[PDB]
Amino acid sequence: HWGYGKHNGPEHWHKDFPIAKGERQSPVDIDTHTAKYDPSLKPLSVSYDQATSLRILNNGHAFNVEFDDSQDKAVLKGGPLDGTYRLIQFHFHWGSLDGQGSEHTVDKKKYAAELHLVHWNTKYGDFGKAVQQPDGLAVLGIFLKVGSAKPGLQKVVDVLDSIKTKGKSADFTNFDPRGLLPESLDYWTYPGSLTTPPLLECVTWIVLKEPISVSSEQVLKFRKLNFNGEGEPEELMVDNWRPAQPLKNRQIKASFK
Ligand SMILES: NS(=O)(=O)c1ccc(CCO)cc1
Ligand SMILES: [Zn+2]
């Protein structure tokens, strides 16, 4: 029953998910002046060449592009990570207007949207077990700004008409998530949480410094989705982001000087 409305949004979540007020909640503001370069960070390895996308689903909160994670087909390694993390899905958070939509902020700047590529630590065997561990997940976050179109996003944009409402899904095979990345893999990293209920504190966040550009037309199509199910009163799927949470006892590290 949680959502992003006045009556079920981020201010209400703690009543059913008390970890909402926990010690390593996400997202956070990334103060670039306070973040410190970490020479101990290993190079980041995004290995998506054998990725097998399967399906796209409107879950009433966002839309997920789901992958076959039964083998090491698309994995994230290196950086702050120990071991291998397998891609299970990606999704976005976005705003009603171009000036808001991201979950993380950079020196308080909000981007139009934010892409989350979600991975689980293979040493735990399955996603469900991984979310019971402090190092169970790694989410690669990428900011979206409005400018030129992102060609690798267009296939996603064009399928959205078929998953307008909650519970709808469509085939989404043969999609290459490499087309959603910027040129640079420079990043910030910190320990955090899922940004939606259940808000579990299992995530190593890796947030890329370089945003991708998407066109106004592309993001406008995100905003035509519905939070509601078919037949129900239309509630546009917009502003599905949690604001920045207290940093508490955490340091954000940078991979770059
Ligand atoms: N927004 S997020 O990437 O922290 C996130 C990833 C995965 C889940 C589990 C429910 O699909 C919840 C939130
Ligand atoms: Zn997310």
Swiss-Prot record:
Outcome (variant: residue 59 to L): Reduced activity
Listed result of changing residue 139 to G: Weakly impaired activity
InterPro entries: CA_dom, CA_dom_sf, Carbonic_anhydrase_a-class, Carbonic_anhydrase_a-class_CS
Cofactor(s), names only, from the UniProt record: Zn(2+); Co(2+)
Annotated consequence of substituting residue 62 to S: 2-fold decrease in enzyme efficiency, as determined by kcat/KM ratio, and efficiently inhibited by chlorzolamide
Cofactor note: Zinc. Can also use cobalt(II) with lower efficiency, but not copper(II), nickel(II) and manganese(II).
Active site: 61
Effect of residue 195 to S/V: Reduced activity
Binding site for Zn(2+): 91, 93, 116
Impact after mutating residue 194 to E/H/R: Strongly reduced CO(2) hydrase activity
Record has Metal-binding as a keyword: yes
Localization, UniProt: Cytoplasm; Cell membrane
Effect of residue 116 to E: Strongly reduced activity
Domain of life: Eukaryota
Task performed by this protein: Catalyzes the reversible hydration of carbon dioxide. Can also hydrate cyanamide to urea. Stimulates the chloride-bicarbonate exchange activity of SLC26A6. Essential for bone resorption and osteoclast differentiation. Involved in the regulation of fluid secretion into the anterior chamber of the eye. Contributes to intracellular pH regulation in the duodenal upper villous epithelium during proton-coupled peptide absorption.
Residues under site feature: Involved in the binding of some activators, including histamine and L-histidine: 89
EC number: 4.2.1.1, 4.2.1.69
Name this protein carries in UniProt: Carbonic anhydrase 2
Catalytic activity: hydrogencarbonate + H(+) = CO2 + H2O; urea = cyanamide + H2O
Binding sites annotated in the UniProt record for substrate: 195-196
